[PDB]
Amino acid sequence: TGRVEGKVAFVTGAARGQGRSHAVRLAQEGADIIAVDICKPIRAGVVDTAIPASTPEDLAETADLVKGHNRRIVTAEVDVRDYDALKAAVDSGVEQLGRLDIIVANAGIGNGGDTLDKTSEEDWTEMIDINLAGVWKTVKAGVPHMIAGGRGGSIILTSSVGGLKAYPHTGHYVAAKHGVVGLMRAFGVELGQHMIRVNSVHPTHVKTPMLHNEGTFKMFRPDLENPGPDDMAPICQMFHTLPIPWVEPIDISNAVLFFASDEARYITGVTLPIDAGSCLK
Amino acid sequence: TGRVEGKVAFVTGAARGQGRSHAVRLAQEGADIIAVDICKPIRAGVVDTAIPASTPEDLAETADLVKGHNRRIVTAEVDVRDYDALKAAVDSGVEQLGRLDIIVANAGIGNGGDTLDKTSEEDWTEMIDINLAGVWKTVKAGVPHMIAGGRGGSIILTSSVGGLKAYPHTGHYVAAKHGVVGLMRAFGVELGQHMIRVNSVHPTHVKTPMLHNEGTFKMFRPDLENPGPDDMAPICQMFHTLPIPWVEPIDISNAVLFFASDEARYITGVTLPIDAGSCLK
Amino acid sequence: TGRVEGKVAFVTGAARGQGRSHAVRLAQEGADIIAVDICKPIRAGVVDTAIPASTPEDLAETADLVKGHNRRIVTAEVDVRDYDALKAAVDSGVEQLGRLDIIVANAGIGNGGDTLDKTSEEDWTEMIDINLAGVWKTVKAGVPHMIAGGRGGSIILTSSVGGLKAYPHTGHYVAAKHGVVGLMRAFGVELGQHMIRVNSVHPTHVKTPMLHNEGTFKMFRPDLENPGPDDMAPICQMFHTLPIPWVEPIDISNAVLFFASDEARYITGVTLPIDAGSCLK
Amino acid sequence: TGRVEGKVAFVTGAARGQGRSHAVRLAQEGADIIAVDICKPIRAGVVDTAIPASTPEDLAETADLVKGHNRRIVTAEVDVRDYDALKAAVDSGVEQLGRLDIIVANAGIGNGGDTLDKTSEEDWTEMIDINLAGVWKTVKAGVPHMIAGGRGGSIILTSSVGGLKAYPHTGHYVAAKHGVVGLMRAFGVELGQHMIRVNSVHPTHVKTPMLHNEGTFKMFRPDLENPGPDDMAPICQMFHTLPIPWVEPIDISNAVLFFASDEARYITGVTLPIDAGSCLK
Numbered sequence A, B, C, D: 001t002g003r004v005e006g007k008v009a010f011v012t013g014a015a016r017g018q019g020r021s022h023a024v025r026l027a028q029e030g031a032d033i034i035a036v037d038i039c040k041p042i043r044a045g046v047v048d049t050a051i052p053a054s055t056p057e058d059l060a061e062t063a064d065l066v067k068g069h070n071r072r073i074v075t076a077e078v079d080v081r082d083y084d085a086l087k088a089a090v091d092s093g094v095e096q097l098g099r100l101d102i103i104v105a106n107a108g109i110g111n112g113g114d115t116l117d118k119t120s121e122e123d124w125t126e127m128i129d130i131n132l133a134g135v136w137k138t139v140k141a142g143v144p145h146m147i148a149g150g151r152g153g154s155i156i157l158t159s160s161v162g163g164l165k166a167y168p169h170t171g172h173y174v175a176a177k178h179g180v181v182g183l184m185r186a187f188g189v190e191l192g193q194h195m196i197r198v199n200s201v202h203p204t205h206v207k208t209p210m211l212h213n214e215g216t217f218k219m220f221r222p223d224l225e226n227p228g229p230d231d232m233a234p235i236c237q238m239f240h241t242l243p244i245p246w247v248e249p250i251d252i253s254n255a256v257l258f259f260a261s262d263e264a265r266y267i268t269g270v271t272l273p274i275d276a277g278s279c280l281k
């Protein structure tokens, strides 16, 4: 039997990166998946962002990978900011798949890059709306289905090392990610009575398009004209106690899997770094 | 002679409660004050709140108390959500008083009271807008004046025990107050280069109208028909290691004063509970 | 293929309880075991302790269980306080089993029960010597074998909820268990360069003879003449967010297994509660 | 009126450095002092230490400074490891001065410098005995006098940044200093009933002979033949968010004074860094 055999997991930001990885790993271990992603640029008139937008095709690819593990998947192209649309998608996914046992609130963005005193209200607001309020909305949408099932469940919120410590030029993201720790604790204290566990994962740098993009390469290596990942690697590695530059999506997925599984049945309220020792520094 | 002699402090939520106490204590110790408060109900059409709104007269009373210590005060009736209006008020205050050395981001609200899965988006959004984004706006408005002075300075953010641990029916407030810890850390890492310190205070229950109101008395003591503070005291006391029911505004002001003063010149990045040992439980 | 297939784990306190469970779970998942336990009363002339001593037969039983999973086990009856004897036992175990990949520093005691200001130096010293210095000695004995292997490895220290928060009448234990968090961090920063991860587990109450003994029953339920586990259960449950009285040894072993496995290859420096939400309170 | 007018403070490690500063600062603010220090080398046959020993004359110099503030002082040359001697000294001090309101458990050492896997049991044991068990003994000796006074009180334990995070080659010290956080929490939960507050201070580098010695200069600047403090400054500064190389004893004393004073009457259970932002990194 797989470690989440017979369960259903709702994963946001599932089009690519960590969210894709979570969908696929959970499916490998026996779960069917409700996979949602915006699949559009975050800001309507704007495609020229450092972090590229995801596409409908990215989400279709996630679906094909999940089906390759002989599991079912319901996909929906929906913005976690649009609560009514998100709730409709989750409602339909639970109709189709029969239950909801696991929530992985993974969807998130980067924007901005100014000091916090020079950050625009537009960048601030978008950041809070997705990375904090969107996580709230994700749990709010899924949890009535988990409660009604009467079997308990497991909720994993994606924070960051930035939910535990700060770094210059990321302050709006740090505020949001710290707020996610509050959501984890608040939901944990309210939902424990239903044998629902709530925990957060805190990745260091992860090899996804959020990290590996031209804008980010240039920010980490302003001394170079056309830096790539190999140029950024030694700078990222300085943040770690283990001598690696970043973790992989599978590393985060393996933590999510642990929390989702019955092997972590009595683990709730925890902030778990998957950070190669960043938080020891 | 005073511990903040010759300094100027910008205090939000100064109409009453802790913010009034901060303004008066800092003035007692030699600071002039830029005091801001919304001075009206939080939600335009709405006075049916458990926590009563502040008034213009409340802020005028604070001003009289500050003047009683032979210090100057500039007051403004402004909502911390309205960044342009807040910035204009602070700009005018610094014109009048000559400098800005201390920021105390104290303004905050309570609302709601449902479980977090049942919290309205209206209540959520108002809470984040004031208790998280309002604190960000407060620092953003004040800090250019502190940087430009070239003398360093001290920024104190008011979080809560709720910014460190959760309690049922307060989850949106907990998310905001945890976000405030992120703001503290983020501003701390960015502003240290200017010899600006950033720290947060985390009160337990404080005797102000935010705690002492009819709605709250009845909520803490549903067994009584007309409960007052004496009836709520033993319930609040159960949260503490020291056998007291709540701290007073002066207790929070004394911590603010410590952080504002040169006696805390090299203290930055700290989360300081004034909590009667709540966080030991 | 087991999650620790082909590895060797060194587990202290392996005669019963959590340590036995760790040996057996790790064996089930493919590891051979170096299992050590004092197998005698902690204090030479003294058998009438609240927590009963382990016996040689207890350790023989652990061995039979590991062999039942078709794995190899080397046992040794040794006190973790006797560094030279412990080192000799580990040296022999590694000779026999070929490598050392995982260290589980699980041996521990309770004693005392007075307030910390009334705790005897005898009780203090024994507590520190086993629960803090014995953990240090365990890692010190095993890690040269792990380093010399050149394959990286994983070290798990057993702390407690008492390594993160205090409770009356357990203060010497709390000091030791907080010291264990220091050892985890210190070894983590030093050993990361070898791709050796170091983490700590923090159990709430666990159903082992350390919890389930006549002395402890009477302490939790002084109102009863002959209390048993059922009488203690509701008191223990008040410490938790999930409505359970205690976790089982397997719950701790499943966390140890996660950290020991390649699925946690980049997780280091973490304090992981398996505490049913005790640390949310 | 001084901020600790009419109080008596018991300070260990009072011969020089931070302890001297605490004694003098508390005296300046109106407290009489029971000042203890070993005033001898730590290890009987041994003066070849990087950190120089204190002397009886150092303690006499502290006493002269306290008397210069027109306060009384009782001095004793006593090792905090010798509980019976320490208790006898405190008992006599309280006879002479009439009460005990404040305890400052400041005495501490450095030794060793190997990795934790290569640290001798001699160095380990001395470190735990003084920096952990010595702190326990200090509170144990003083606190009955505080309890019996019936006026409440304040206990400050000196930990370190090393009680919150680790650094290579300091692991035994880190274990002890983390244990001190456990003592603080344990005493906090037990003594709150008596209106006794317990808190810890966590200095970064402090300009005392523990930091400023030949051995340490050479260790921080192996590239130089005869390095002094000016050469060590930029290396220490790299650990901080504020651009300073170290704090001064007065900075720690100002935090001790705050906690000792009625201005911190409801503050208990807190870990307070005076660290120039080290813990933000």
Ligand SMILES: NC(=O)c1ccc[n+]([C@@H]2O[C@H](COP(=O)([O-])OP(=O)(O)OC[C@H]3O[C@@H](n4cnc5c(N)ncnc54)[C@H](O)[C@@H]3O)[C@@H](O)[C@H]2O)c1
Residues within 6 Å of the ligand: A012, A013, A014, A015, A016, A017, A018, A019, A036, A037, A038, A039, A040, A042, A051, A053, A054, A078, A079, A080, A081, A106, A107, A108, A109, A110, A130, A134, A158, A159, A160, A161, A202, A203, A204, A205, A206, A207, A208, A209, A210, A211
């Ligand atoms: N990549 C890193 O280094 C790193 C480090 C720490 C934490 N994180 C966090 O991990 C999580 C996953 O990020 P990732 O690395 O996979 O990045 P990613 O950008 O590859 O994936 C994020 C996915 O979320 C989706 N998304 C964003 N906003 C959305 C919205 N409003 N509604 C629905 N979907 C939305 C995106 O379209 C994208 O497909 C995020 O919360 C991120 O903040 C990332």
Ligand SMILES: NC(=O)c1ccc[n+]([C@@H]2O[C@H](COP(=O)([O-])OP(=O)(O)OC[C@H]3O[C@@H](n4cnc5c(N)ncnc54)[C@H](O)[C@@H]3O)[C@@H](O)[C@H]2O)c1
Residues within 6 Å of the ligand: B012, B013, B014, B015, B016, B017, B018, B019, B036, B037, B038, B039, B040, B042, B051, B053, B054, B078, B079, B080, B081, B106, B107, B108, B109, B130, B134, B158, B159, B160, B161, B202, B203, B204, B205, B206, B207, B208, B209, B210, B211
């Ligand atoms: N009272 C408690 O028990 C308690 C406990 C922990 C933390 N806190 C926090 O302490 C701080 C002070 O609260 P208090 O106890 O003095 O309560 P209070 O309600 O007496 O005072 C808060 C003041 O903030 C003002 N304010 C609210 N929203 C505003 C806005 N948008 N713009 C400008 N001013 C605004 C109010 O008008 C009021 O005068 C708040 O951040 C609160 O969350 C309070």
Ligand SMILES: NC(=O)c1ccc[n+]([C@@H]2O[C@H](COP(=O)([O-])OP(=O)(O)OC[C@H]3O[C@@H](n4cnc5c(N)ncnc54)[C@H](O)[C@@H]3O)[C@@H](O)[C@H]2O)c1
Residues within 6 Å of the ligand: C012, C013, C014, C015, C016, C017, C018, C019, C036, C037, C038, C039, C040, C042, C051, C053, C054, C078, C079, C080, C081, C106, C107, C108, C109, C110, C130, C134, C158, C159, C160, C161, C202, C203, C204, C205, C206, C207, C208, C209, C210, C211
């Ligand atoms: N049982 C609980 O509720 C609980 C809660 C939190 C943490 N812990 C910790 O979990 C760990 C395991 O305890 P357990 O619950 O399995 O209790 P247990 O008493 O059943 O098992 C502990 C084992 O450690 C062995 N041991 C003790 N001192 C030793 C020494 N000097 N040298 C070698 N072996 C020695 C004992 O003989 C015993 O076999 C301990 O570190 C304990 O402090 C236990």
Ligand SMILES: NC(=O)c1ccc[n+]([C@@H]2O[C@H](COP(=O)([O-])OP(=O)(O)OC[C@H]3O[C@@H](n4cnc5c(N)ncnc54)[C@H](O)[C@@H]3O)[C@@H](O)[C@H]2O)c1
Residues within 6 Å of the ligand: D012, D013, D014, D015, D016, D017, D018, D019, D036, D037, D038, D039, D040, D042, D051, D053, D054, D078, D079, D080, D081, D106, D107, D108, D109, D110, D130, D134, D158, D159, D160, D161, D202, D203, D204, D205, D206, D207, D208, D209, D210, D211
């Ligand atoms: N100096 C730093 O950079 C630094 C940084 C963090 C924490 N600390 C801590 O601050 C405290 C004060 O150290 P300091 O900087 O003033 O150093 P210091 O060496 O100048 O002073 C420490 C004093 O403690 C005394 N002492 C040591 N062992 C003793 C014992 N067994 N009994 C009685 N007295 C004893 C010494 O004789 C000395 O007078 C210590 O706990 C230390 O670990 C220091």
